Every structure is written in structure tokens, then in C-alpha cells.
Amino acid sequence: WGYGKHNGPEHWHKDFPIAKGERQSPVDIDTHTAKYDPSLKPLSVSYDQATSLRILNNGHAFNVEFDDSQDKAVLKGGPLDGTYRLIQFHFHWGSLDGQGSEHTVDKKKYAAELHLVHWNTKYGDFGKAVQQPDGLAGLGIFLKVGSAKPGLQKVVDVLDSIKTKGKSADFTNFDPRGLLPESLDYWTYPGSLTTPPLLECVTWIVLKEPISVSSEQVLKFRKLNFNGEGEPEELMVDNWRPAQPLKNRQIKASF
Ligand SMILES: [Hg+2]
Ligand SMILES: [Zn+2]
């Protein structure tokens, strides 16, 4: 699996049958069909005590890893019951600015989409959480092309170092509070991971308001490699998956 012509999302059902699941992700958010639920509480993001360890190129994206041995960076409130621990965040981008996000707003696609992944901390470890229907919380943030995002420059500058598949680099003192929008208004629904094993373990929380990044910021993204150092160079682009069937499921809005 990859995003190639021969191992793209259209081929994952063969290796991971849940690809054709009942609670698959991403999906199209029909803002006119989303149900305003006044029973939804505000989100609570406690990232002031966050501890970043390193950045890694896994061959399909890059991951910014955080120390989740304790409640340093947590997500609670909203549609969730209990605390969720920030284990990692990564992005999805396109080759061009007209595609890249995984979730769509009224069929509209953004340049990129940031996924902040958290696990339910009544299950003790990530491995355990992915065995539960409410094991994970994906915090979805759309990225659009405009003004530069200061808080993202650190990431962009270190990409050089994790150019290829398997490379990693120390990446401590990185504050995630810098990648958040002003408003916390969100849409929520029961989904899955957007990549293999595609576990139908996730509670999606997609923010209304996108963050803006510069053309030259998103540009360094496109310079990453899928391939391993010393292999024919295949640029890491369009590492996103096409929207799936809602299938009866319903999308709630906090606004
Ligand atoms: Hg699950
Ligand atoms: Zn993702």
C-alpha cells in the first residue's frame, strides 16, 4: 500500500477488507445536512505541557512524535468521554493547491489537512485503544494557501533532514498550540484512520476554521520522498485518501 497507481486506496480493500467498512474515513461534510447538536460541549485542548521527541518520515508521510507516558498534552470535552493522549500529528497534502485534504466541506478540498492523533487513556496504550470503538480521537485541521504560519516554520526547516523513508530526527520543544486556529467550532462523527490498517476506532473532530500557510511552506512538504535513500525518487505528494460513504451515519455540528 501507498498512493501509487498500483497500490493506491482503490487497492487497499484486498489487504485490509475493512477498507469497505461501515464507519470508514474521510467523508464529505455536507454543512447543510450536519445536525446542530446543542448537547455538545466545547473542546478542551491542554497542550501547554507538550513534549515533542522527534520527526520521522515513515514512507507515506512524516510524524511528529510526542511523549505519552503522562497527561502532558490532552484533549477532553466536546463529544468525547474522558481524556485522550496526543501521541502524534502528521499531514496530508496534494501535488497542487486544489487538492490535499482528506475531509471535504461541501465538496471543497483544501491544500492540506493536519491530523492530531490521541488515544483514550482508559485503555492504557495505543495498541489497546485501536481495539476499541472509542479508542482514538482525531483532531482535524484544514490548511489553506495564504499567509505564512510562524508556528510551522520549525517543522518545515527540519524536513531537509528526514528527506527519505526511514529518516528521523530529534524534534523537542515543539509547541503544537501554534498549529491551532482561533476558533474551536467543529463537526464530529464516528470514523477510522485514513490509512492502513484503517481501524474503525476513531471519533473525528474536524474544525470549521482552517489555518493559513504560505506557498513556500507547503512547497517544502512536496519535496519529501516516499522512497528510501538510494532508491529511484518518487516525491511524496497526494498522500491523501478519497472520501468514503457516510452510510447512514450522521455528522454533528457544535455551531
Ligand atoms: Hg476499533
Ligand atoms: Zn491522517
UniProtKB/Swiss-Prot annotation:
Top-rank taxon of the source lineage equals Eukaryota
Give start and end of each Alpha-carbonic anhydrase domain.
1-255
A molecular function (GO) term? arylesterase activity
Record annotation: effect of changing T194 to S/V? Reduced activity
- Which CDD domains does the entry link to? alpha_CA_I_II_III_XIII
In the record, the effect of Q88P is given as: In OPTB3; in Czechoslovakia
Binding-site residues, substrate: T194, T195
Question: Residue numbers for the site described as Fine-tunes the proton-transfer properties of H-64?
Answer: Y3, N58, N63
SUPFAM superfamilies, per the entry: Carbonic anhydrase
Q: What is the effect of changing A61F?
A: Reduced activity
Activity regulation per the record? Activated by X-ray, histamine, L-adrenaline, L- and D-phenylalanine, L- and D-histidine, L-His-OMe and beta-Ala-His (carnosine).
Catalytic residues, per the record, are: H60
Q: Which residues form the signal peptide?
A: none
The annotated consequence of N63Q reads: 2-fold decrease in enzyme efficiency, as determined by kcat/KM ratio, and efficiently inhibited by chlorzolamide
Q: Extract one GO cellular component term from the record.
A: plasma membrane
How is the subunit organization of this protein annotated in UniProt? Interacts with SLC4A4. Interaction with SLC4A7 regulates SLC4A7 transporter activity. Interacts with SLC26A6 isoform 4 (via C-terminus cytoplasmic domain).
Name the UniProt record assigns to this protein: Carbonic anhydrase 2
